[PDB]
C-alpha cells in the first residue's frame, strides 16, 4: 500500500521459504547462499521439509550471546540446489528502537501476510516461554501462534524475526550483520 510494504513484499517474493520442522511451519529467511534463520524453538534437526521438499541441514547454530544467554535466533545452512539474493547489506550493524515496520508472513496457514505494527522499541530482556532472552524488540501488535520465523522490516532494513507475544504485544529477535560475516 507504501513504501514500507514494498520493501517488505520484495523481501518475501525472493527471500523466504515456508520450512516445516516436527514443531510446525515458519516462515523462514533466507540472508545469503544457502543460510537462513528461523526462532530456535523451531528444534531443527538433520533434516527439514523447505517448501514440502526433504532438504538436509548441513549446520544449524542457536545463537547466544557473550553472557550464554539464549538470542532465539538458529542460522541454518541448507543442503539446497540454489542460493538466495545476498541481503546481509540491508542488516543493521548495532542495538536500535525503529519506527514504522511491517511483520510479514508467508505460510500455508497465512499465506501473502503483511502487518503494520508501527514503533518497534529496543525492549532487551525478555522471559520468553521461561527462557531468559537478549536482544529483544517489542511491537504493540497482539501477535498470534503460527507468525514465528515472520519478518520485520522497515525501508531498507531487515531488522529481525518474530518469536512470540503475550496477546498486547508481539516480539522479534534482532538480526545483525556481525551474525552472517562468513
Same mark, same amino acid.
Given at each position: ?7 517488505? #513484499?520484495?523481501?518475501? $517474493?525472493?527471500? /523466504? ?11 523462514? !529467511? ?10 530456535? *524453538?523451531?528444534?531443527? %534437526? ?15 547454530? =542457536? ?5 550464554? &544467554? ?11 540446489? #540454489? $542460493? @538466495?539474493?545476498?541481503?546481509? *547489506? ?10 514504522? =515496520?511491517? !511483520?510479514?508472513?508467508?505460510?500455508? $496457514? ?17 522471559? !520468553?516461554?521461561?527462557?531468559? &532472552? ?6 504493540? @501488535?497482539? /501477535?498470534?501462534? %503460527? #507468525? ?18 503475550? %496477546?498486547? #504485544?508481539? @516480539? ?7 551474525? @552472517?560475516?562468513?
Amino acid at each position: 500500500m507504501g513504501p514500507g510494504f514494498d520493501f517488505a #513484499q520484495a523481501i518475501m $517474493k525472493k527471500n /523466504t521459504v515456508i520450512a516445516r520442522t516436527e514443531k510446525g511451519e515458519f516462515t523462514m !529467511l533466507g540472508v545469503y547462499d544457502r543460510v537462513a534463520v528461523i526462532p530456535t *524453538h523451531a528444534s531443527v %534437526g538433520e533434516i527439514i521439509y523447505i517448501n514440502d521438499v526433504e532438504t538436509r541441514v548441513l549446520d544449524a547454530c =542457536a545463537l547466544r550471546d557473550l553472557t550464554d &544467554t539464549n538470542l532465539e535466533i538458529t542460522i541454518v545452512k541448507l543442503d539446497r540446489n #540454489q $542460493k @538466495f539474493r545476498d541481503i546481509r *547489506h540491508f542488516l543493521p550493524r548495532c542495538e536500535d528502537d525503529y519506527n514504522d =515496520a511491517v !511483520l510479514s508472513v508467508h505460510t500455508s $496457514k497465512f499465506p501473502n501476510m503483511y502487518i503494520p505494527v508501527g514503533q518497534v522499541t529496543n525492549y532487551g530482556f525478555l522471559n !520468553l516461554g521461561g527462557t531468559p &532472552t537478549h536482544r529483544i524488540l517489542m511491537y504493540n @501488535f497482539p /501477535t498470534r501462534a %503460527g #507468525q514465528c520465523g515472520g519478518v520485520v522490516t522497515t525501508t531498507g532494513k531487515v531488522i529481525g524475526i518474530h518469536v512470540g507475544g503475550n %496477546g498486547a #504485544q508481539g @516480539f522479534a529477535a534482532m538480526l545483525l550483520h556481525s551474525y @552472517f560475516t562468513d
